[PDB]
Amino acid sequence: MGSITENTSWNKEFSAEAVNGVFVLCKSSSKSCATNDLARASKEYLPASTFKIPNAIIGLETGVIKNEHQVFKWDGKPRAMKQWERDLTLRGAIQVSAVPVFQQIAREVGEVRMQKYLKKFSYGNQNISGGIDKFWLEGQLRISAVNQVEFLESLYLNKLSASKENQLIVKEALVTEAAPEYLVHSKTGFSGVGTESNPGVAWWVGWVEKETEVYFFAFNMDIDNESKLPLRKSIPTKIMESEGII
Template sequence: MQRLTVFFLCCWAVAARAQDCNIPGNTVIYDYREQRWTFTDSADALKTSLPASTFKVINLLIALETGVIKDEMAIVKWPGYTDTTLYGYRPSIYKDMTVKEAFEVSAGWVFMELSKKIGKERYRHYLAACQYGNGNLSRNDPDFWNYGPFEISPRNQVEFLIKVYEEKLPFSKRSFEILKRVMVTERTDNYVIRSKTGWTRVYGNDYGWWVGYLEKKDNVYFFATRLVKDRKVINPDFSSCRKQITIQKLKELKAM
């Protein structure tokens, strides 16, 4: 029987204030070697919400596996739309770009163009096979990961990432290799972090994610942090807090 240990961190609020964050949220961490789960809020870890741009992780795998793109250097043509409601007001990303660049700068329109080519039926197949999210793709537009009823929990995010690391999902080894290259966000002599941020604005709130895993020579730590903030509350550090809080928790667990 698989050994399972669960730890609960009690210092979320103190840690957040120490970094001038003071934002409600939750971090889930899984210690791969020790098979140990750590939750800052075990109940919230099971609550679902839109994955926002963290969906680009599985989206890239699906686009590769279905042949919608050949590799991460495939170029997606800017369709010429300028509707800020649809694409967000970020003029710097409104250009032809590779899928790799789109992943790195989180250019949502690129993955929306891929979404149109993939289609809902193929999404349903892969999402069910990967046990990713609640499977509700009823929203009738290609950006279902930012708006609508499609949701995933922080724990589910980590469970999915473990399977990505182990390559135990219905994708080719080549697709996994490409994804893992694209996901690298930090590399040092001691560890590599593969990750993706996400941020969406719905129901009067900001939802901010940072998900991924920290890989060392002797262990791997998987993580998912989700912050939720009332949009009327101004906090210019909301974006950076997703990473700050996660890194502090990893340091508390001696992962860094």
């Protein structure tokens, strides 16, 4: 990555909520990044559902996901969340974080192909052991906020080791906010409430295209209570809108 500068004043938003976390924000027009905590910016955590971004690209690249219009049919069996009990498009599955859809995609991709692509993507520690359908949820895979922004910037520029076509498909699927001159691509993540002395992690990563400017961001925080989930978006949002990226 380029240069990164620690800005301890950003901790203001974290203190107010008594949250232990990190936010990394990079402005493309300068190749510079800022963060409230340099140490945690480089610390690696379970990616949780933010892993659906590389998983989607790999699914497309390997042909497991036939094309952008593939519909993932619900077999009718009970699923962990009601929002997943329905047929979903690739964008739909990603947007509602439909774990079972991507677990099946991961099984079809397989260990060998999955490993190959995470190496090509320089994705975290590239550790997929423990079970092909859950390594990003409870396995040994880990990735840092800094590595997330590097990865997302590559995707934005279509520089990942995959077809431009597939990177573009996954990119539209990640759009979460659209205005004439304000476009946001993002993905949430939540590993769970963790265990005693081992909190879970919550994520919010993506990028913002405001006019001719582009900002890449990655946020993660320790979490042991679902009631704190909204903070994964509110803290980053307050930090960015305090930076003029309203």
